[PDB]
Subunit: 128 residues, 4 copies
Protein backbone atom coordinates (compact mmCIF):
# COMPACT_ATOMS: atom_id res chain seq x y z
CA UNK A 1 0.00 0.00 0.00
CA UNK A 2 0.75 3.83 -0.40
CA UNK A 3 -1.78 4.03 2.44
CA UNK A 4 0.74 1.90 4.39
CA UNK A 5 3.81 3.91 3.40
CA UNK A 6 2.17 7.23 4.37
CA UNK A 7 1.08 6.16 7.88
CA UNK A 8 4.40 4.42 8.45
CA UNK A 9 6.28 7.66 7.66
CA UNK A 10 3.90 9.60 9.93
CA UNK A 11 5.15 7.31 12.67
CA UNK A 12 8.77 7.60 11.61
CA UNK A 13 9.01 4.05 10.14
CA UNK A 14 9.69 2.58 6.69
CA UNK A 15 8.67 -1.01 7.49
CA UNK A 16 5.70 -2.54 9.30
CA UNK A 17 6.82 -3.20 12.86
CA UNK A 18 7.26 -6.73 14.04
CA UNK A 19 4.18 -6.36 16.31
CA UNK A 20 1.65 -5.70 13.52
CA UNK A 21 0.38 -8.01 10.75
CA UNK A 22 -2.14 -7.22 8.02
CA UNK A 23 -4.28 -9.74 6.14
CA UNK A 24 -6.92 -9.21 3.54
CA UNK A 25 -9.86 -11.37 2.68
CA UNK A 26 -10.00 -11.47 -1.13
CA UNK A 27 -13.51 -11.58 -2.48
CA UNK A 28 -16.57 -13.08 -0.99
CA UNK A 29 -15.27 -16.69 -1.11
CA UNK A 30 -12.28 -16.09 1.09
CA UNK A 31 -12.69 -19.59 2.71
CA UNK A 32 -9.57 -21.28 1.32
CA UNK A 33 -7.45 -18.22 2.33
CA UNK A 34 -9.06 -18.01 5.73
CA UNK A 35 -8.10 -21.67 6.27
CA UNK A 36 -4.47 -21.22 5.21
CA UNK A 37 -3.98 -18.09 7.23
CA UNK A 38 -5.50 -19.69 10.29
CA UNK A 39 -3.07 -22.62 9.76
CA UNK A 40 -0.07 -20.31 9.42
CA UNK A 41 -0.94 -18.31 12.52
CA UNK A 42 -1.27 -21.59 14.45
CA UNK A 43 2.06 -23.02 13.23
CA UNK A 44 4.45 -20.11 13.43
CA UNK A 45 6.53 -19.66 16.53
CA UNK A 46 6.02 -15.95 17.05
CA UNK A 47 2.77 -14.12 16.65
CA UNK A 48 2.05 -10.43 16.07
CA UNK A 49 0.48 -8.30 18.91
CA UNK A 50 -2.15 -6.86 16.45
CA UNK A 51 -3.65 -8.19 13.22
CA UNK A 52 -5.63 -5.93 10.85
CA UNK A 53 -8.13 -7.87 8.85
CA UNK A 54 -9.01 -5.84 5.65
CA UNK A 55 -12.56 -6.43 4.38
CA UNK A 56 -12.64 -3.80 1.52
CA UNK A 57 -12.69 -6.67 -1.08
CA UNK A 58 -15.62 -8.51 0.44
CA UNK A 59 -18.82 -7.50 -1.30
CA UNK A 60 -21.27 -9.52 0.82
CA UNK A 61 -21.15 -12.27 3.47
CA UNK A 62 -23.61 -15.04 4.10
CA UNK A 63 -23.92 -17.30 7.13
CA UNK A 64 -21.12 -19.44 5.74
CA UNK A 65 -18.57 -16.61 5.49
CA UNK A 66 -19.76 -15.22 8.87
CA UNK A 67 -19.07 -18.50 10.62
CA UNK A 68 -15.72 -18.79 8.82
CA UNK A 69 -14.70 -15.27 9.84
CA UNK A 70 -15.84 -15.98 13.41
CA UNK A 71 -13.75 -19.19 13.71
CA UNK A 72 -10.70 -17.42 12.24
CA UNK A 73 -10.93 -14.58 14.73
CA UNK A 74 -11.48 -17.02 17.60
CA UNK A 75 -8.35 -18.86 16.53
CA UNK A 76 -6.28 -15.60 16.63
CA UNK A 77 -7.77 -14.44 19.97
CA UNK A 78 -6.83 -17.66 21.57
CA UNK A 79 -3.08 -16.96 20.80
CA UNK A 80 -3.23 -13.49 22.31
CA UNK A 81 -3.69 -11.56 19.00
CA UNK A 82 -5.82 -8.43 19.05
CA UNK A 83 -7.80 -8.29 15.84
CA UNK A 84 -8.86 -5.05 14.18
CA UNK A 85 -11.22 -5.00 11.21
CA UNK A 86 -11.20 -2.30 8.49
CA UNK A 87 -12.93 -1.45 5.25
CA UNK A 88 -16.30 -3.31 5.51
CA UNK A 89 -18.72 -1.78 2.96
CA UNK A 90 -22.07 -0.40 4.20
CA UNK A 91 -23.87 -3.68 3.96
CA UNK A 92 -21.18 -5.99 5.29
CA UNK A 93 -20.76 -3.38 8.13
CA UNK A 94 -24.46 -4.00 9.18
CA UNK A 95 -23.98 -7.77 8.84
CA UNK A 96 -20.88 -7.72 11.06
CA UNK A 97 -22.98 -6.03 13.86
CA UNK A 98 -26.02 -8.31 13.46
CA UNK A 99 -23.88 -11.47 13.39
CA UNK A 100 -21.88 -10.68 16.52
CA UNK A 101 -18.51 -10.12 14.77
CA UNK A 102 -18.32 -6.57 16.15
CA UNK A 103 -19.01 -7.96 19.64
CA UNK A 104 -16.23 -10.43 19.16
CA UNK A 105 -13.55 -8.00 18.26
CA UNK A 106 -14.82 -4.98 20.18
CA UNK A 107 -16.58 -1.84 18.65
CA UNK A 108 -13.48 0.22 19.31
CA UNK A 109 -11.45 -2.13 17.01
CA UNK A 110 -13.65 -1.74 13.91
CA UNK A 111 -12.59 1.02 11.41
CA UNK A 112 -14.30 2.35 8.33
CA UNK A 113 -10.96 2.45 6.39
CA UNK A 114 -7.65 0.79 6.59
CA UNK A 115 -5.59 3.91 7.24
CA UNK A 116 -7.43 4.61 10.45
CA UNK A 117 -6.91 0.96 11.66
CA UNK A 118 -3.19 1.20 10.75
CA UNK A 119 -2.84 4.58 12.51
CA UNK A 120 -4.57 3.20 15.63
CA UNK A 121 -2.43 0.05 15.69
CA UNK A 122 0.88 1.88 15.25
CA UNK A 123 -0.17 4.23 18.06
CA UNK A 124 -1.06 1.32 20.38
CA UNK A 125 2.24 -0.44 19.63
CA UNK A 126 4.17 2.76 20.44
CA UNK A 127 2.41 3.15 23.80
CA UNK A 128 3.11 -0.60 24.55
CA UNK B 1 -23.49 -7.42 -6.74
CA UNK B 2 -25.75 -4.39 -7.81
CA UNK B 3 -28.01 -7.24 -8.96
CA UNK B 4 -28.03 -8.27 -5.27
CA UNK B 5 -28.61 -4.78 -3.88
CA UNK B 6 -31.57 -4.15 -6.24
CA UNK B 7 -33.47 -7.36 -5.43
CA UNK B 8 -32.72 -6.95 -1.73
CA UNK B 9 -34.27 -3.46 -1.76
CA UNK B 10 -37.28 -4.81 -3.70
CA UNK B 11 -37.78 -7.08 -0.72
CA UNK B 12 -37.17 -4.32 1.81
CA UNK B 13 -33.70 -5.59 2.90
CA UNK B 14 -30.14 -4.22 2.79
CA UNK B 15 -28.35 -7.47 3.69
CA UNK B 16 -28.70 -11.06 2.49
CA UNK B 17 -30.90 -12.84 5.01
CA UNK B 18 -29.42 -15.46 7.24
CA UNK B 19 -31.38 -18.18 5.35
CA UNK B 20 -29.75 -17.60 1.93
CA UNK B 21 -26.16 -18.20 0.78
CA UNK B 22 -24.67 -17.57 -2.65
CA UNK B 23 -21.59 -19.27 -4.11
CA UNK B 24 -20.02 -18.94 -7.50
CA UNK B 25 -17.96 -21.42 -9.40
CA UNK B 26 -15.06 -19.45 -10.88
CA UNK B 27 -14.00 -20.69 -14.27
CA UNK B 28 -14.12 -24.13 -15.67
CA UNK B 29 -11.62 -25.61 -13.17
CA UNK B 30 -13.64 -24.81 -10.10
CA UNK B 31 -12.51 -28.13 -8.43
CA UNK B 32 -10.33 -26.70 -5.65
CA UNK B 33 -13.12 -24.19 -4.74
CA UNK B 34 -15.80 -26.84 -4.92
CA UNK B 35 -13.75 -28.90 -2.43
CA UNK B 36 -13.24 -26.04 0.03
CA UNK B 37 -16.83 -24.93 -0.08
CA UNK B 38 -18.05 -28.47 0.42
CA UNK B 39 -15.69 -28.67 3.44
CA UNK B 40 -16.96 -25.40 4.89
CA UNK B 41 -20.61 -26.34 4.51
CA UNK B 42 -19.86 -29.65 6.27
CA UNK B 43 -17.98 -28.04 9.18
CA UNK B 44 -20.06 -25.02 10.07
CA UNK B 45 -22.65 -25.33 12.78
CA UNK B 46 -25.52 -23.58 11.04
CA UNK B 47 -26.46 -23.99 7.43
CA UNK B 48 -28.49 -21.76 5.13
CA UNK B 49 -32.04 -22.86 4.00
CA UNK B 50 -31.18 -22.04 0.31
CA UNK B 51 -27.90 -21.89 -1.61
CA UNK B 52 -27.65 -20.25 -5.04
CA UNK B 53 -24.88 -21.71 -7.09
CA UNK B 54 -23.85 -19.15 -9.83
CA UNK B 55 -22.54 -20.75 -13.03
CA UNK B 56 -22.17 -17.57 -15.22
CA UNK B 57 -18.32 -17.94 -15.06
CA UNK B 58 -18.23 -21.55 -16.20
CA UNK B 59 -17.63 -21.70 -19.93
CA UNK B 60 -17.87 -25.48 -20.38
CA UNK B 61 -18.02 -28.61 -18.19
CA UNK B 62 -16.65 -32.04 -18.90
CA UNK B 63 -17.40 -35.31 -17.12
CA UNK B 64 -14.92 -34.34 -14.43
CA UNK B 65 -16.61 -31.03 -13.53
CA UNK B 66 -20.06 -32.70 -13.84
CA UNK B 67 -19.17 -35.34 -11.29
CA UNK B 68 -17.61 -32.68 -9.03
CA UNK B 69 -20.72 -30.49 -9.23
CA UNK B 70 -22.91 -33.55 -8.58
CA UNK B 71 -20.98 -34.57 -5.42
CA UNK B 72 -21.05 -30.98 -4.12
CA UNK B 73 -24.80 -30.71 -4.55
CA UNK B 74 -25.31 -34.14 -2.96
CA UNK B 75 -23.27 -32.98 0.01
CA UNK B 76 -25.51 -29.86 0.45
CA UNK B 77 -28.78 -31.81 -0.02
CA UNK B 78 -27.82 -34.20 2.66
CA UNK B 79 -27.68 -31.28 5.22
CA UNK B 80 -31.12 -30.03 4.25
CA UNK B 81 -29.95 -27.24 1.87
CA UNK B 82 -32.09 -26.48 -1.17
CA UNK B 83 -29.80 -25.69 -4.07
CA UNK B 84 -30.74 -23.32 -6.88
CA UNK B 85 -28.58 -22.93 -9.97
CA UNK B 86 -28.34 -19.72 -12.05
CA UNK B 87 -26.51 -18.33 -15.03
CA UNK B 88 -25.49 -21.49 -17.01
CA UNK B 89 -24.62 -20.44 -20.59
CA UNK B 90 -26.48 -22.10 -23.50
CA UNK B 91 -24.13 -25.00 -23.76
CA UNK B 92 -23.56 -25.72 -20.09
CA UNK B 93 -27.42 -25.43 -19.74
CA UNK B 94 -27.81 -28.43 -22.20
CA UNK B 95 -25.03 -30.33 -20.40
CA UNK B 96 -26.70 -29.84 -17.00
CA UNK B 97 -29.92 -31.49 -18.41
CA UNK B 98 -28.12 -34.35 -20.18
CA UNK B 99 -25.95 -35.11 -17.14
CA UNK B 100 -28.80 -35.28 -14.63
CA UNK B 101 -27.85 -32.11 -12.67
CA UNK B 102 -31.24 -30.54 -13.45
CA UNK B 103 -32.92 -33.74 -12.18
CA UNK B 104 -30.90 -33.49 -9.03
CA UNK B 105 -31.83 -30.00 -8.10
CA UNK B 106 -35.29 -29.88 -9.68
CA UNK B 107 -36.25 -28.03 -12.98
CA UNK B 108 -38.10 -25.40 -10.99
CA UNK B 109 -34.81 -24.48 -9.18
CA UNK B 110 -32.77 -23.72 -12.32
CA UNK B 111 -32.74 -20.03 -13.48
CA UNK B 112 -31.35 -18.42 -16.58
CA UNK B 113 -29.96 -15.45 -14.55
CA UNK B 114 -28.97 -14.78 -11.03
CA UNK B 115 -31.53 -12.07 -10.33
CA UNK B 116 -34.40 -14.42 -10.97
CA UNK B 117 -32.86 -17.09 -8.61
CA UNK B 118 -32.32 -14.40 -5.93
CA UNK B 119 -35.89 -13.07 -6.35
CA UNK B 120 -37.30 -16.62 -6.09
CA UNK B 121 -35.23 -17.44 -3.00
CA UNK B 122 -36.10 -14.24 -1.14
CA UNK B 123 -39.77 -14.92 -1.93
CA UNK B 124 -39.56 -18.51 -0.64
CA UNK B 125 -37.81 -17.38 2.56
CA UNK B 126 -40.53 -14.78 3.18
CA UNK B 127 -43.30 -17.37 2.78
CA UNK B 128 -41.37 -19.75 5.16
CA UNK C 1 -13.65 -21.19 -25.88
CA UNK C 2 -14.89 -19.93 -29.39
CA UNK C 3 -12.15 -22.31 -30.55
CA UNK C 4 -14.21 -25.02 -28.79
CA UNK C 5 -17.58 -23.93 -30.18
CA UNK C 6 -16.26 -23.84 -33.78
CA UNK C 7 -14.73 -27.34 -33.77
CA UNK C 8 -17.76 -28.73 -31.94
CA UNK C 9 -20.07 -27.38 -34.67
CA UNK C 10 -17.75 -28.79 -37.35
CA UNK C 11 -18.45 -32.14 -35.75
CA UNK C 12 -22.17 -31.49 -35.42
CA UNK C 13 -22.12 -30.99 -31.60
CA UNK C 14 -22.93 -28.13 -29.22
CA UNK C 15 -21.42 -29.67 -26.08
CA UNK C 16 -18.13 -31.44 -25.36
CA UNK C 17 -18.83 -35.16 -25.55
CA UNK C 18 -18.74 -37.23 -22.43
CA UNK C 19 -15.53 -38.95 -23.66
CA UNK C 20 -13.36 -35.80 -23.80
CA UNK C 21 -12.09 -33.57 -20.97
CA UNK C 22 -9.94 -30.45 -21.24
CA UNK C 23 -7.70 -29.02 -18.52
CA UNK C 24 -5.39 -26.07 -18.60
CA UNK C 25 -2.30 -25.43 -16.57
CA UNK C 26 -2.50 -21.78 -15.49
CA UNK C 27 0.86 -20.09 -15.34
CA UNK C 28 4.20 -21.53 -14.58
CA UNK C 29 3.34 -22.48 -10.96
CA UNK C 30 0.50 -24.80 -11.84
CA UNK C 31 1.48 -27.18 -8.93
CA UNK C 32 -1.53 -26.64 -6.66
CA UNK C 33 -3.90 -27.10 -9.67
CA UNK C 34 -2.02 -30.12 -10.91
CA UNK C 35 -2.48 -31.67 -7.44
CA UNK C 36 -6.22 -30.97 -7.27
CA UNK C 37 -6.89 -32.19 -10.76
CA UNK C 38 -4.92 -35.35 -10.16
CA UNK C 39 -7.02 -35.86 -6.99
CA UNK C 40 -10.29 -35.31 -8.84
CA UNK C 41 -9.39 -37.69 -11.66
CA UNK C 42 -8.49 -40.33 -9.04
CA UNK C 43 -11.72 -39.91 -7.04
CA UNK C 44 -14.41 -39.66 -9.67
CA UNK C 45 -16.24 -42.77 -10.72
CA UNK C 46 -16.13 -42.29 -14.47
CA UNK C 47 -13.17 -41.05 -16.42
CA UNK C 48 -12.96 -39.49 -19.88
CA UNK C 49 -11.40 -41.49 -22.82
CA UNK C 50 -9.20 -38.45 -23.79
CA UNK C 51 -7.85 -35.50 -21.81
CA UNK C 52 -6.39 -32.43 -23.54
CA UNK C 53 -3.87 -30.69 -21.39
CA UNK C 54 -3.53 -27.00 -22.57
CA UNK C 55 -0.07 -25.50 -22.00
CA UNK C 56 -0.57 -22.09 -23.79
CA UNK C 57 -0.41 -20.30 -20.36
CA UNK C 58 2.84 -21.88 -19.25
CA UNK C 59 5.73 -19.57 -20.06
CA UNK C 60 8.59 -21.82 -18.90
CA UNK C 61 9.04 -25.07 -16.95
CA UNK C 62 11.86 -26.07 -14.68
CA UNK C 63 12.72 -29.51 -13.32
CA UNK C 64 10.08 -29.04 -10.65
CA UNK C 65 7.19 -28.41 -13.07
CA UNK C 66 8.51 -31.16 -15.40
CA UNK C 67 8.38 -33.74 -12.64
CA UNK C 68 4.94 -32.49 -11.58
CA UNK C 69 3.61 -32.71 -15.14
CA UNK C 70 5.15 -36.18 -15.49
CA UNK C 71 3.49 -37.52 -12.29
CA UNK C 72 0.13 -36.03 -13.33
CA UNK C 73 0.24 -37.68 -16.74
CA UNK C 74 1.35 -40.99 -15.19
CA UNK C 75 -1.63 -40.80 -12.86
CA UNK C 76 -4.05 -40.32 -15.83
CA UNK C 77 -2.42 -43.07 -17.95
CA UNK C 78 -2.81 -45.52 -15.20
CA UNK C 79 -6.67 -45.05 -15.32
CA UNK C 80 -6.80 -45.61 -19.06
CA UNK C 81 -6.88 -41.90 -20.09
CA UNK C 82 -5.14 -40.91 -23.31
CA UNK C 83 -3.50 -37.55 -22.78
CA UNK C 84 -2.99 -35.02 -25.55
CA UNK C 85 -0.93 -31.87 -25.05
CA UNK C 86 -1.52 -28.58 -26.92
CA UNK C 87 -0.22 -25.05 -27.05
CA UNK C 88 3.36 -25.37 -25.64
CA UNK C 89 5.34 -22.24 -26.67
CA UNK C 90 8.60 -22.68 -28.62
CA UNK C 91 10.75 -23.07 -25.57
CA UNK C 92 8.49 -25.24 -23.46
CA UNK C 93 8.02 -27.37 -26.67
CA UNK C 94 11.85 -28.09 -26.69
CA UNK C 95 11.79 -28.76 -22.93
CA UNK C 96 8.93 -31.26 -23.28
CA UNK C 97 11.06 -33.27 -25.82
CA UNK C 98 14.30 -33.09 -23.81
CA UNK C 99 12.55 -34.07 -20.56
CA UNK C 100 10.77 -37.12 -21.96
CA UNK C 101 7.21 -35.71 -21.72
CA UNK C 102 6.72 -36.15 -25.48
CA UNK C 103 7.90 -39.78 -25.12
CA UNK C 104 5.40 -40.27 -22.37
CA UNK C 105 2.37 -39.12 -24.22
CA UNK C 106 3.45 -40.05 -27.75
CA UNK C 107 4.67 -37.59 -30.52
CA UNK C 108 1.42 -38.07 -32.39
CA UNK C 109 -0.52 -36.69 -29.34
CA UNK C 110 1.32 -33.35 -29.10
CA UNK C 111 -0.28 -30.39 -31.00
CA UNK C 112 0.97 -26.90 -31.63
CA UNK C 113 -2.52 -25.40 -30.92
CA UNK C 114 -5.58 -26.41 -29.07
CA UNK C 115 -7.93 -26.50 -32.05
CA UNK C 116 -5.90 -29.18 -33.73
CA UNK C 117 -5.87 -31.33 -30.49
CA UNK C 118 -9.65 -30.83 -30.14
CA UNK C 119 -10.24 -31.72 -33.82
CA UNK C 120 -8.09 -34.86 -33.46
CA UNK C 121 -9.82 -35.96 -30.26
CA UNK C 122 -13.35 -35.47 -31.60
CA UNK C 123 -12.33 -37.46 -34.69
CA UNK C 124 -10.89 -40.31 -32.59
CA UNK C 125 -14.02 -40.42 -30.39
CA UNK C 126 -16.23 -40.63 -33.50
CA UNK C 127 -14.22 -43.55 -34.91
CA UNK C 128 -14.40 -45.30 -31.45
CA UNK D 1 9.84 -13.76 -19.14
CA UNK D 2 11.61 -11.71 -21.98
CA UNK D 3 14.08 -11.04 -19.15
CA UNK D 4 14.56 -14.85 -19.13
CA UNK D 5 14.85 -15.24 -22.90
CA UNK D 6 17.47 -12.46 -23.16
CA UNK D 7 19.82 -13.82 -20.46
CA UNK D 8 19.36 -17.36 -21.75
CA UNK D 9 20.48 -16.27 -25.25
CA UNK D 10 23.43 -14.39 -23.72
CA UNK D 11 24.48 -17.75 -22.36
CA UNK D 12 23.77 -19.56 -25.61
CA UNK D 13 20.60 -21.35 -24.36
CA UNK D 14 16.91 -21.33 -25.32
CA UNK D 15 15.60 -23.21 -22.27
CA UNK D 16 16.26 -22.92 -18.54
CA UNK D 17 18.89 -25.52 -17.70
CA UNK D 18 17.95 -28.50 -15.62
CA UNK D 19 20.03 -27.13 -12.70
CA UNK D 20 18.04 -23.90 -12.21
CA UNK D 21 14.45 -23.37 -11.00
CA UNK D 22 12.59 -20.10 -10.57
CA UNK D 23 9.62 -19.49 -8.27
CA UNK D 24 7.72 -16.34 -7.56
CA UNK D 25 5.80 -15.38 -4.49
CA UNK D 26 2.56 -13.80 -5.73
CA UNK D 27 1.34 -10.99 -3.55
CA UNK D 28 1.75 -10.49 0.11
CA UNK D 29 -0.32 -13.56 1.10
CA UNK D 30 1.87 -16.07 -0.65
CA UNK D 31 1.30 -18.64 2.20
CA UNK D 32 -0.77 -21.22 0.30
CA UNK D 33 1.77 -21.13 -2.60
CA UNK D 34 4.72 -21.30 -0.26
CA UNK D 35 3.17 -24.45 1.26
CA UNK D 36 2.55 -26.16 -2.09
CA UNK D 37 5.96 -25.34 -3.45
CA UNK D 38 7.63 -26.57 -0.30
CA UNK D 39 5.60 -29.80 -0.68
CA UNK D 40 6.59 -30.22 -4.32
CA UNK D 41 10.28 -29.65 -3.64
CA UNK D 42 10.10 -32.26 -0.86
CA UNK D 43 8.31 -34.88 -2.99
CA UNK D 44 10.09 -34.74 -6.32
CA UNK D 45 12.93 -37.10 -6.97
CA UNK D 46 15.40 -34.66 -8.46
CA UNK D 47 16.05 -31.17 -7.21
CA UNK D 48 17.59 -28.16 -8.93
CA UNK D 49 21.12 -26.93 -7.90
CA UNK D 50 19.83 -23.28 -7.65
CA UNK D 51 16.39 -21.79 -6.99
CA UNK D 52 15.64 -18.11 -7.64
CA UNK D 53 12.89 -16.84 -5.45
CA UNK D 54 11.31 -13.69 -7.10
CA UNK D 55 9.91 -11.17 -4.60
CA UNK D 56 8.96 -8.32 -7.05
CA UNK D 57 5.21 -9.03 -6.38
CA UNK D 58 5.46 -8.84 -2.61
CA UNK D 59 4.54 -5.37 -1.43
CA UNK D 60 5.19 -5.85 2.30
CA UNK D 61 5.91 -8.72 4.72
CA UNK D 62 4.90 -9.07 8.32
CA UNK D 63 6.19 -11.51 10.93
CA UNK D 64 3.87 -14.14 9.52
CA UNK D 65 5.24 -13.98 5.95
CA UNK D 66 8.82 -13.69 7.31
CA UNK D 67 8.49 -16.90 9.27
CA UNK D 68 6.83 -18.59 6.27
CA UNK D 69 9.62 -17.48 3.93
CA UNK D 70 12.22 -18.61 6.50
CA UNK D 71 10.72 -22.14 6.83
CA UNK D 72 10.48 -22.47 3.03
CA UNK D 73 14.12 -21.55 2.54
CA UNK D 74 15.18 -23.87 5.37
CA UNK D 75 13.29 -26.68 3.67
CA UNK D 76 15.18 -26.06 0.35
CA UNK D 77 18.60 -25.69 2.04
CA UNK D 78 18.18 -28.98 3.72
CA UNK D 79 17.93 -30.73 0.26
CA UNK D 80 21.09 -29.08 -1.00
CA UNK D 81 19.38 -26.22 -2.95
CA UNK D 82 21.13 -22.86 -3.08
CA UNK D 83 18.50 -20.16 -2.87
CA UNK D 84 18.89 -16.75 -4.49
CA UNK D 85 16.42 -13.94 -3.86
CA UNK D 86 15.62 -11.16 -6.38
CA UNK D 87 13.36 -8.17 -6.77
CA UNK D 88 12.55 -7.19 -3.12
CA UNK D 89 11.24 -3.58 -3.11
CA UNK D 90 13.01 -0.98 -0.93
CA UNK D 91 11.00 -1.74 2.15
CA UNK D 92 10.86 -5.52 1.92
CA UNK D 93 14.68 -5.31 1.20
CA UNK D 94 15.20 -3.66 4.69
CA UNK D 95 12.85 -6.20 6.30
CA UNK D 96 14.75 -9.14 4.79
CA UNK D 97 18.00 -7.81 6.45
CA UNK D 98 16.40 -7.04 9.82
CA UNK D 99 14.63 -10.42 9.96
CA UNK D 100 17.69 -12.53 9.20
CA UNK D 101 16.55 -13.73 5.73
CA UNK D 102 19.65 -12.18 4.11
CA UNK D 103 21.81 -14.01 6.70
CA UNK D 104 20.06 -17.21 5.82
CA UNK D 105 20.66 -17.12 2.14
CA UNK D 106 23.92 -15.15 2.12
CA UNK D 107 24.34 -11.40 1.12
CA UNK D 108 26.04 -12.44 -2.10
CA UNK D 109 22.84 -14.34 -3.15
CA UNK D 110 20.44 -11.38 -2.87
CA UNK D 111 19.87 -9.35 -6.12
CA UNK D 112 18.02 -6.12 -6.72
CA UNK D 113 16.47 -7.50 -9.98
CA UNK D 114 15.74 -10.83 -11.45
CA UNK D 115 18.01 -10.52 -14.48
CA UNK D 116 21.07 -10.15 -12.31
CA UNK D 117 20.08 -13.28 -10.22
CA UNK D 118 19.47 -15.23 -13.46
CA UNK D 119 22.80 -14.07 -14.95
CA UNK D 120 24.64 -15.05 -11.75
CA UNK D 121 22.98 -18.47 -11.57
CA UNK D 122 23.64 -19.35 -15.21
CA UNK D 123 27.27 -18.31 -14.70
CA UNK D 124 27.61 -20.48 -11.56
CA UNK D 125 26.03 -23.48 -13.32
CA UNK D 126 28.47 -23.10 -16.24
CA UNK D 127 31.49 -23.04 -13.90
CA UNK D 128 30.08 -26.15 -12.06
K1 LIG E 1 -10.92 -7.79 1.70
K1 LIG F 1 -19.62 -19.22 -12.10
K1 LIG G 1 -1.77 -23.46 -19.84
K1 LIG H 1 6.93 -12.03 -6.05
Amino acid sequence: NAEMSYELAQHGRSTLPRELAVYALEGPFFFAAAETFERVMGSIQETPQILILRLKWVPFMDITGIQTLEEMIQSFHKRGIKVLISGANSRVSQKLVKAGIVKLVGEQNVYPVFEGALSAALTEIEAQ
